[PDB]
Every structure is written in structure tokens, then in C-alpha cells.
Amino acid sequence: GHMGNAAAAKKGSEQESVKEFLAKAKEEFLKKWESPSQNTAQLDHFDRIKTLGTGSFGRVMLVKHKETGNHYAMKILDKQKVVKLKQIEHTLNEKRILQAVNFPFLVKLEFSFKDNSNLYMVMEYVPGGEMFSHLRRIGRFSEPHARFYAAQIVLTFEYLHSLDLIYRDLKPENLLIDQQGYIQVTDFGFAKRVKGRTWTLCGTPEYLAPEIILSKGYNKAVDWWALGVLIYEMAAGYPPFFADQPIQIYEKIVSGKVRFPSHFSSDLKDLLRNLLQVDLTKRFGNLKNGVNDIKNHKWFATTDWIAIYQRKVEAPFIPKFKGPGDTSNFDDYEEEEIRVSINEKCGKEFTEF
Amino acid sequence: TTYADFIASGRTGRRNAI
Ligand SMILES: N#Cc1cc(-c2cccc([C@@H]3COCCN3)c2)ccc1N
């Protein structure tokens, strides 16, 4: 067979230890999921420094805690805009997930609170910014570099899926790089607790699994498809399915055909053909052996999963450190006021926040 | 080439969700 006695016993033991870890992690998650933390700071505890990003209902700002001097990333959501954009449930759910999960590659919610006008999520500041910018700048990542990041996503999805959470918005834009070169996943706006199937059309076109495009009920296997897209994009510099308009992207996704750059190793192509598998009865991560088909694949043969989890592997890339509080890895935005009305808005809708 | 096709797609920047 492929393994002698010692190696097979070691692998079996490692896999049993994962089960034991996940069972404890679920117990811890469920306690926080059922009794969420609320109201752990207030706005005047922080100095505003700079806007890191701005979008439909909110903004992310670099802030400094006045007493410790620690920097944080504060997401500010305007309650009235959340209601108008039909995002109440997603907003409450994102905060409930963030305060309940605990994993080294998931961003930590350090404080949360609300006032008359806004909701505030104070998260760790991750100064390397988005993987997206580094990838577009460098062009593509070598296979060992891509593999280092891929391994973190595999472990993070193994964790999330054990909690019955589907993630649904994997892409380089959503992965931040910390000062040690490790990944931080931040955005849980599309995540859902799903033990079986779900039906919502959500995600980003290049990363959508075929079953989402085809308006099927779908499961956590969509995240394993998305991992294939991410690994491909990291190693090639462009995603596997692209075109001028989304409908043409969707035709390519459902076709069952994918082409690879000539520099991809055979091991990488084999892994990707098994992740980017249209047929759900054949897709890695969705078979009887679950995540182990991925973790035990030849492309990951050099990966020490525990050492990745313990953050003991030297990262292949460390973002330029320009001081605690430097913002060079985020874009520049016009600075707008943080208005707090004298009257409470949408109180009932956000009681749980 | 595939890379040139990617540039031509106009989808090299940050991508929005559906
Ligand atoms: N540090 C940090 C930190 C930064 C962000 C963030 C900052 C700017 C832009 C974005 C966009 C948000 O939606 C599109 C993808 N990423 C996210 C979000 C959460 C954070 N903890």
C-alpha cells in the first residue's frame, strides 16, 4: 500500500486527534453562540485615525484605544442604511459568528457596541492588508507560497464546517495578511449555519460553484470548490474562469473544463481537478473521507498541519513593517464624519447586537 | 495568451459580490 505500518498509525492517530479537537471546539463555540457578548466598549474609548475602506452601508476605520494605545480596525455600520439595504439578519449574524468563533486564522472581535445611529465592531488590526494587493503586485505566488496559504484555509474550513458554518465568500480580497505572514479571514456577511442544504444566490462570480449558478440546493462543498479557485488564482495570478461579463464566466464554470498554466506541477493540477469538480459525487471535501482527501493529497505531502496551526512555520512573505498603525497596505479614502443622532434609530431591529 | 485575456476581461481589480 502507500504507507507502511508506522506512517499509517501516525496518520490515523493524527486524524483521531483532529476529531477530538473539533469536538471540544464545538462545545466552546456553542456556549458563545447561545450567549453572545454585547456592549464591551464605547466610542469615546477610541481615537479615529484613518478610513481603511468604505462601502454600501459602512466603513472600516483604523482607531487607537486611548488607554492602551493599541490599534484596531473598527467597522461602522449605519443602522438606518442596514435596514434600507435589507441587511439586518446578515449584520446580526456576522457579529454573532465573530464573537463565537475562535481559530488562529479568523479575525478576532475585540469589542462591540452600538449607539443611537451606528453599530460598531472593533476587530484586530491586520496591517499587511489584503492578499489581493500582494498577489496582483507580485503577479503570482510560487507553489510553496500558495501552499502555505492554502493550508491555512483548509484548516479554517475544517474548523468552520465542523460548526456547521458555510463561509461562501472566499477570495483574495477577503484574506488579510498579518505581521507574521499568516492569513486572517474577516468577512462573515455571507456565512450561514447550515447542517444540510441552503439555496441563496450569493458570492463572487469567479468563485461561485456550479451548483450555485444552476440554482440548486447546495452544501459546504461550495467552499471546497472556492478553495480550488483560490489556489489556482494564487499559483497562476489569474482565476480559472474569467470573461468580460459574469454570464460568460458562469458558462465556463458549469462546463466541466479547466485549463492550467504550463508551470503548474502535476500534483497541483491533480488537486485542482478534484476540487474544481462539477460532479458533487466526486468533489474532494464532499466524499466519505471528507477533508482528509485534501489534507492527504500529494500536493500537501510536505505540509505539517500541526505546525501551521501552531504558527511555527516560517512564512514565505512578511509584509513591510512600517510601524504599528501604518496604513500603507490599505487604500486612501476621503474622511467623513461619524454622526451620532440625538434620537435612537432602529432600536428594536438591533436589540441583539 | 491567457494572461492577456485576463487583462482584456476588465476584471483584474477588486471584485464585488453578487
Ligand atoms: N485590519 C483590518 C480589517 C480590515 C477590513 C477591511 C478594510 C478595507 C476594505 C475591506 C474590504 C471589505 O469588503 C471588500 C473586501 N475587503 C475590509 C475589514 C476587517 C478588518 N479587521
Side-chain angles (χ1 to χ4, degrees), chain A residues 147-178 180-194 196-215:
Chain A
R147 180 159 49 237
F148 172 78
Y149 295 148
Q152 298 170 59
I153 301 304
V154 172
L155 292 177
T156 300
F157 284 176
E158 183 169 43
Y159 172 79
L160 290 174
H161 292 175
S162 83
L163 308 178
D164 304 311
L165 289 164
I166 307 175
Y167 182 67
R168 303 197 291 191
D169 203 25
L170 189 69
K171 54 181 172 187
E173 294 92 318
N174 284 164
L175 301 176
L176 307 181
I177 309 298
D178 72 24
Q180 293 82 40
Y182 283 75
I183 286 180
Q184 292 276 104
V185 183
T186 54
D187 298 340
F188 283 85
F190 294 150
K192 189 182 181 181
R193 200 150 187 250
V194 175
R197 318 167 87 180
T198 200
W199 288 265
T200 305
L201 170 61
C202 61
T204 299
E206 283 80 346
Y207 283 75
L208 292 184
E211 58 270 30
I212 304 177
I213 289 160
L214 294 168
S215 301

Side-chain angles (χ1 to χ4, degrees), chain A residues 52-53 60 73 107 123-126 130 173-174 176 186-187 330:
Chain A
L52 302 177
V60 182
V107 75
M123 291 171 278
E124 308 181 79
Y125 179 52
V126 187
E130 296 177 3
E173 294 92 318
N174 284 164
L176 307 181
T186 54
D187 298 340
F330 296 89

Side-chain angles (χ1 to χ4, degrees), chain A residues 300-319 321 323-333 335 338 340:
Chain A
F300 285 116
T302 64
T303 298
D304 183 337
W305 297 99
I306 296 293
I308 292 285
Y309 170 79
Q310 297 186 338
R311 304 168 60 97
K312 285 180 181 186
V313 179
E314 185 187 352
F317 171 65
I318 303 297
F321 169 83
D326 185 82
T327 53
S328 282
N329 292 300
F330 296 89
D331 271 312
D332 295 323
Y333 291 92
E335 299 293 338
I338 301 173
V340 182

Side-chain angles (χ1 to χ4, degrees), chain A residues 210-227:
Chain A
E211 58 270 30
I212 304 177
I213 289 160
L214 294 168
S215 301
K216 300 189 166 303
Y218 62 84
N219 72 359
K220 63 194 177 70
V222 302
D223 280 337
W224 297 121
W225 174 280
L227 174 67

